Amino acid sequence: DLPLDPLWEFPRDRLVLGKPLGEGAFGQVVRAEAFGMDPARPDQASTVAVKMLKDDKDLADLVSEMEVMKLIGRHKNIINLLGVCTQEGPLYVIMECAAKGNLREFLRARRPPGPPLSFPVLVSCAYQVARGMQYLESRKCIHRDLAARNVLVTEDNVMKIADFGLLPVKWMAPEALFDRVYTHQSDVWSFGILLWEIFTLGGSPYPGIPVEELFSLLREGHRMDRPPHCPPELYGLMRECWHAAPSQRPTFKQLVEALDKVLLAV
Numbered sequence: 001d002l003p004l005d006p007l008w009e010f011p012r013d014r015l016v017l018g019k020p021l022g023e024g025a026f027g028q029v030v031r032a033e034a035f036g037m038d039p040a041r042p043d044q045a046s047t048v049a050v051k052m053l054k055d056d057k058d059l060a061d062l063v064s065e066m067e068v069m070k071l072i073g074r075h076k077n078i079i080n081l082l083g084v085c086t087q088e089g090p091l092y093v094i095m096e097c098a099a100k101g102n103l104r105e106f107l108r109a110r111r112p113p114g115p116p117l118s119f120p121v122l123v124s125c126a127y128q129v130a131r132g133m134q135y136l137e138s139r140k141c142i143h144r145d146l147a148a149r150n151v152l153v154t155e156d157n158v159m160k161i162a163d164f165g166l167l168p169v170k171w172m173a174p175e176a177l178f179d180r181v182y183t184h185q186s187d188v189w190s191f192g193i194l195l196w197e198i199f200t201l202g203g204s205p206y207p208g209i210p211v212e213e214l215f216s217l218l219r220e221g222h223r224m225d226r227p228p229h230c231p232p233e234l235y236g237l238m239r240e241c242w243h244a245a246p247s248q249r250p251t252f253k254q255l256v257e258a259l260d261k262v263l264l265a266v
């Protein structure tokens with residue numbers, strides 16, 4: 001329909017698509033061979049991920065999303081926007097591609113047998129999501145879901161958060177679960193569930209509990225118990241992210257330091 005941004009408008013010509021990546025809600029995401037995304041060498045080649053429509057009000061959600069990534073600008077620990085294609089009809093959105101796709105899945109594959117993923121790599125995994133979440137808050141942006149299935153893993157073990165903006169109940173915080181309100185502190189709760197999702201090497205939160213009286217059990221103070229081999233400072237950090245009072249929940253800036261003071265044990 002509408003205009004063309006020289007800061008992001010890419011020629012469809014230099015972009016040969018490829019095989020999908022798999023979800024969902026807003027649109028389909030396919031691997032795609034884009035040529036010359038780095039204009040230093042226009043003969044270069046790389047593998048980027050492209051977002052399209054299936055066919056819709058989803059054309060408004062899709063554009064509303066594209067506009068927002070332009071706003072926040074680049075960053076390391078978030079999926080960065082690379083370019084777009086609105087010129088000749090169908091809307092393509094070109095962004096960074098993480099080959100080890102997805103976290104939650106990143107862990108359940110390197111999962112040892114029951115009794116590679118060393119401890120520091122896992123602190124690296126979380127400390128990156130910490131830095132990415134603080135950036136989103138500072139740009140006045142928000143990310144509600146925040147599961148280990150919303151964090152993508154680059155080729156180099158770099159964590160890039162997926163999706164942001166200005167049913168999955170085990171991750172939601174009380175005030176969002178019952179009052180339907182989301183603050184920066186509701187994310188700090190979700191990040192704690194994420195911390196637990198990692199040190200269990202991709203487990204399911206509150207294992208073996210029906211999603212339904214879960215609220216009553218949290219209405220008692222019963223948070224999940226220290227995963228095995230998780231050193232107490234980390235479970236100590238999860239309990240803080242699970243404090244019922246949001247004003248007693250840590251800010252993301254403090255989750256950066258605590259995790260950085262740990263990463264520095266080395």
Ligand SMILES: C[C@@H](Oc1ccc2[nH]nc(/C=C/c3cnn(CCO)c3)c2c1)c1c(Cl)cncc1Cl
Pocket residue numbers: 021022023024029049079095096097098099100101102103149150151152162
């Ligand atoms: C719905 C999908 O959107 C995206 C958005 C940006 C992306 N940049 N790069 C990937 C690569 C995903 C991948 C890489 N390897 N594999 C094989 C897995 O079987 C899948 C990717 C996926 C998704 C997925 Cl597929 C996963 N988690 C979150 C999201 Cl949003």
